[PDB]
Amino acid sequence: DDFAYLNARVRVRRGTLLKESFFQEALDLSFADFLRLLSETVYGGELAGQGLPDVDRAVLRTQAKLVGDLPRLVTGEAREAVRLLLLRNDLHNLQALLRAKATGRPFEEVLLLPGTLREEVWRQAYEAQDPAGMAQVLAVPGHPLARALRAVLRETQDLARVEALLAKRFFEDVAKAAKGLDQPALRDYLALEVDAENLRTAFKLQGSGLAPDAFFLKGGRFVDRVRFARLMEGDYAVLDELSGTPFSGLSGVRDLKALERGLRCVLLKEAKKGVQDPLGVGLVLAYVKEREWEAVRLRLLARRAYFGLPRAQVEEEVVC
Amino acid sequence: AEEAAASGGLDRGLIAVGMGLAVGLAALGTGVAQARIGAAGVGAIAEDRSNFGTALIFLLLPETLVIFGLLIAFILNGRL
Amino acid sequence: AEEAAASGGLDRGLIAVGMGLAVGLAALGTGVAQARIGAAGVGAIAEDRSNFGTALIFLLLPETLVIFGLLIAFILNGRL
Amino acid sequence: AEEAAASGGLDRGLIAVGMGLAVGLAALGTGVAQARIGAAGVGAIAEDRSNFGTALIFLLLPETLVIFGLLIAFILNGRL
Amino acid sequence: AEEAAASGGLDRGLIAVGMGLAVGLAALGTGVAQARIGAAGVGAIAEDRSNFGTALIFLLLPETLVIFGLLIAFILNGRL
Amino acid sequence: AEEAAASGGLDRGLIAVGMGLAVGLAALGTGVAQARIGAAGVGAIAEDRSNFGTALIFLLLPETLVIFGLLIAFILNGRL
Amino acid sequence: AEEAAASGGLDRGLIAVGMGLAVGLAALGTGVAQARIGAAGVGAIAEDRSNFGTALIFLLLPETLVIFGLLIAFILNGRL
Amino acid sequence: AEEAAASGGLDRGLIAVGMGLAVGLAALGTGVAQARIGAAGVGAIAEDRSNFGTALIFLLLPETLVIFGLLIAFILNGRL
Amino acid sequence: AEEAAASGGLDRGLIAVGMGLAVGLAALGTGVAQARIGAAGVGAIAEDRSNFGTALIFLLLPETLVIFGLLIAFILNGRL
Amino acid sequence: MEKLVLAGPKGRAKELLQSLQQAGVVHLETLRPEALSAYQLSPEERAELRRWEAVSAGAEHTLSLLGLEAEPARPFPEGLEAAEKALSPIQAHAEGLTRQKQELEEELALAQAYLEPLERLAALAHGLDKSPFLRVIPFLLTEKELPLVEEALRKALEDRYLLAHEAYAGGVPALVVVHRKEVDQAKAALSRAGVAELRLPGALGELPLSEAARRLKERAEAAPRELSEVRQHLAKLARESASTLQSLWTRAQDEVARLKALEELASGRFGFALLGYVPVKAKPKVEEANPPWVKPFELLVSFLNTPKYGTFDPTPVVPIFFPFWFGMIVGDIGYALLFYLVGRWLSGYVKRNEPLVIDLFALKLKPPVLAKLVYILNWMVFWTVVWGLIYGEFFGTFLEHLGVFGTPEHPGLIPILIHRIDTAKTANLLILLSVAFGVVMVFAGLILRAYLGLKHRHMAHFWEGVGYLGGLLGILALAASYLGNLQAGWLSALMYLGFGVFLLSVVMSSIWLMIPEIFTQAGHILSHIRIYAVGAAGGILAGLLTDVGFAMAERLGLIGVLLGIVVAGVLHLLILLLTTLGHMLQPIRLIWVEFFTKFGFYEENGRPYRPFKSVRETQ
């Protein structure tokens, strides 16, 4: 098993993470100067073309070899712990894959990177012609996200529903396993991920007339059914009573964009102070949030530069 | 025994070997327990200040075990 | 055993040998109990500077575990 | 023991076994406390050079335990 | 002198077990304590070569326990 | 005891039992440190050759611990 | 006893029993440490097919301890 | 190894206990060393069908501790 | 030789005690090893539902160490 | 005159100015950062810089393709025009050759894989792959799959389908031949088993089988010959013009650095700044202005001249290292004796390695430039091995003797039987002799530590540093009461009580808010003692492994033992090396207790300037 070698491999990698002062420089640059800067970094090391499709691809391929190769390098008890983190990036691939089989559209225009399910699992799944067979091919790597899929697929074959019940059931699955793999660092974070999900499920489905109890799943810290119901009526006075959590910063805010920005920045923060717990999954935890967030800012800074958008429209979203 | 002179007992020496076990293991165990609640307490303040009280009530509980152990050692050895 | 001076009877020796088990096992327990809260404790400061005090006060409690184990040992050793 | 350098009684050898434990085990506990908190301190410097000190004050606290073992050994082998 | 033999003795053998606890246990705690620091040290040099001094001072730090344990063993076993 | 060319004796034999604990434990601690760091060193050279020297220095450091446990052991048994 | 000793009996036998503890513990620490890294190491060989060797050499390093400790017991148990 | 009269004897028993230890202890270290690396390594062949040859050469490196202990054990407690 | 202490007295007594350690430890190192391979092995049957044969054989490999230790001991005390 | 621009740090304003003043540059006047503003590069200047980067990069690109990269210190002054005209033909030619080479290599890789199946398949339905009447579908099956596929097809397609297969060494490439308009059904049958159609990349995949098979056989034969040629032309181009690129690279790089220098100085990013004037003559002149001991000292003079704190020279370090370092080597039978030989291979040359070529021309595993730098190091190693051979006879004082010990100079059976460094009295004094040097180093670091706070003028460091040195005295005092008991050390049993007052009495004058932490200051004292003890005793242990490696460990000793022991001896060598190299790291481990704790030394928890480990790497 064991994170002893694996943590060590990641510590060398934390050396080539992009510090805050790069994005600071990049805003001052035009697209031509941005491109010269980008090539110094490790995302730059996969670059294959000046234009936009190529920037999206260099970023993605950097994430595929430095982050998406982690579950293979461990096994067992190590592997389950690392796997839960990786699983969110796999769910994104799965939801798109499930949707290409079902609505008959090509394999293309989806997210592919390795994680827990390999590239070949997604190709064999795609080519499967019965949803049940599609499901056994997915169940081969082993993970809680299969077991979550399997139960939802028994109730339904409707696209929109499978998507929602899979996500709900999946975070519930994740939580139980994670609580049983211990460590304070992971527990604090898990709580925030669920709390953030809860808020966020409420925002995405806002005003659809639905049940507010459906947007609250266990794992919480301070949020409950009533806050959800008020929130659903359109009242944001609930967020103004929400303190003692690091979402203290959501108070007095009522725009969906500022609210959701806020949750992603909070989750970033928890993970960045998990490096005072680098033992076990703590360090990897911090490493994945930072590679993800970094990749996102280079894509936003590249878009902002190419189309000559307003600076303040993106300067605020590239810092927490 | 006493530090003063007022005890003697061939039987008692054997009682000391056997009793050293019970105190030592109870302090080991109580400590390991204590730590989990204390790390948990870090989380409790983080989650909500007002229910620092919750960390406090659980945290009292492993203490009972060492304390109980100290009294058992005195009765079996050192009472006289 | 003896407090002042080294043991000079086989019985005094044997008691010493037992009493050691309690201070050793405790000594170890203070150590493990400190580490989980202690490592987190830095994190306390980090997250919230004002509640640096909250972490320390938890860490202090395992120190109690050793002093309780010593007191039994200090009394018991002097005579048989 | 208090009297041991190149010869000694069978009895003296027995106090040396028991007391030997108490210090050795403190060193053991110090090292476990140190492992966790030390490892955390490497995170802190990495992030910000200037708050090497916070890690150091939290770390300074398990040293107290090694010193506590010494004193138990010292008193019980023979009072100063 | 401090800790020597040339002829051995029955007394010495019991003395030998006792002195052996201290070095053995201390080094076990030194080994683990280093080991964790050592893992974290890969990270210190990696982020910045301006914390690289700090990483060296952390690594030297768990040695004090083992050095201390050599000393307790020599002292107890060479004081009259 | 002796280690000139033999160490035969029932008395010496007692010393031999006593020391081997200390070697044992010291060697045990070395095993956890040296291996973990050695793996960590192979990752350092593979990504960056600008940290190939740090990786090598770290490997050596846990070797001192196992030698300490041998040296004490030799010392009680007739010296070097 | 051994084929490079010519002192056997009860006397050699106590030493052999006792010194045997040390190698066994050196093997235990070595054992646990080699295994964890070796498993992670499969991924290392998997990645580096031209630098596969590096992984192989890191495995060999904990073994150095066990074997070194056997050789020390050999000297002690027969030097003629 | 062998049992006979000329690979046997009372003289042979003193050798047999020491040498017997050598296989046991080597066996101890080997089982744990081999397990994680072997657990992960058989797994690799299950996943990727091009690591099977690598896994077999890799597997023998922890096997080396028992094979080593075995050569000592066999020769010294052979015939004559 | 055999394990006795009245078919050879004190000389014999040492062989019996020492040999027990080789078997006992062979059994510990194997026992733990079996668990690791078992734990990993589950993945392999789920993944490849007809590569049942691969998981069973990988598991067999630690059993080898107990058959090695347990026989060596048995042959040697089988002489008489 | 030529205008020249200068920078430095604020801390060394006077020392920098004095040095520059002497060097050639005259008329030195200070400039504050507000003056440096408004002298940022004009757009034309930035365009030259952009262009200088392209040439730098562009070489790195061309030179990497062509073969290996090498960075010399030899530029070739040229224009913008000259450098870009140089670069354009070679980059073009090389880009072109590498592209052919990739296409040639990919084609081979596919053709090597898929010639044998396509041959087999083409053969089976020969002349019936270009007919409209019959449809063919190629696909691969393994022995395992063949029965399933046949069943599936047979039920789906009745008995008016044709399933044929022909082997190739392993599985079978199979072909199913079906009527036109029975294509969908045929496909559906393969898809249900999980088997799918084999189609190759490009035109070949789309061509009839017979065309595809003939052409693949042709490509496998042609490619290896053409690949050889393209690789050859590319090798020649590197051979003749690798230098041209390297010289452009260096020159281009110097210009980039110069223009970057002016943009930084311009934004007022150097705190102490000077302006001055040099005649054209003066312009070179400004840039212009027992081996064991002397040799490393002359390179250290460059660090004498740049101080950074209240610190003193980093030069006390080197003679503390040398005695202690030589005394880790103490063998004389197959330890120091074997190690003598090692010295010659680093300070001469070998070819018995592959990554290492000939050292005499500066060619090693290490980069060719680094290898020329570590000549000095290699010498310092050579001096250590030499002196270790002498301290191997020092050890043999305690071994060899014809009456004092029970082992002659060379017995006539085998050199060395049993070591006679197992005398109790003999081991203790060599340990106590070694300890004395560790003590001398404790005084030397803390005495400089105080002088540091006196001349850095921070009383808090002075006071703390003085006090800690009192504790050493207590530490030694206490030891004497146990090393001599009351026969000796009854001359320090009463000074010890007062030595303890001194430890705390000066430290409290700075106050200090962690009084316990003084325990760890006493930890540092203790280490110098234990490390020097480990340095002797662990050194001596090195020799005692050699008992069973090149000394009697077979029979009772005899003539045969000499050439029998070498079985174990060689196996023992790599084991021996690994543990004794571990000891040689003690000198630096010792040094760092004091060096990074600011005991008359530059470092103190971080801060620029290297650990002495890295300094001594080259010296």
From Swiss-Prot, chain A:
Name listed for the protein in its UniProt record: V-type ATP synthase subunit C
Organism: Thermus thermophilus (strain ATCC 27634 / DSM 579 / HB8)
Gene Ontology CC: proton-transporting V-type ATPase, V0 domain
InterPro entries given in the database record: ATPase_csu/dsu_sf, ATPase_V0-cplx_csu, ATPase_V0-cplx_csu/dsu, V-ATPase_V0D/AC39_subunit, V-type_ATPase_csu/dsu, V-type_ATPase_csu/dsu_dom_3
Keyword Ion transport set for record: yes
GO aspect biological process, one term: proton motive force-driven plasma membrane ATP synthesis
Record-level Gene Ontology MF annotations: ATP binding; proton-transporting ATP synthase activity, rotational mechanism; proton-transporting ATPase activity, rotational mechanism
Role summary: Produces ATP from ADP in the presence of a proton gradient across the membrane.
SUPFAM superfamilies (UniProt xref): V-type ATP synthase subunit C (SSF103486)
Keywords from the named record: ATP synthesis, Hydrogen ion transport, Ion transport, Transport
Family, per entry: Belongs to the V-ATPase V0D/AC39 subunit family.
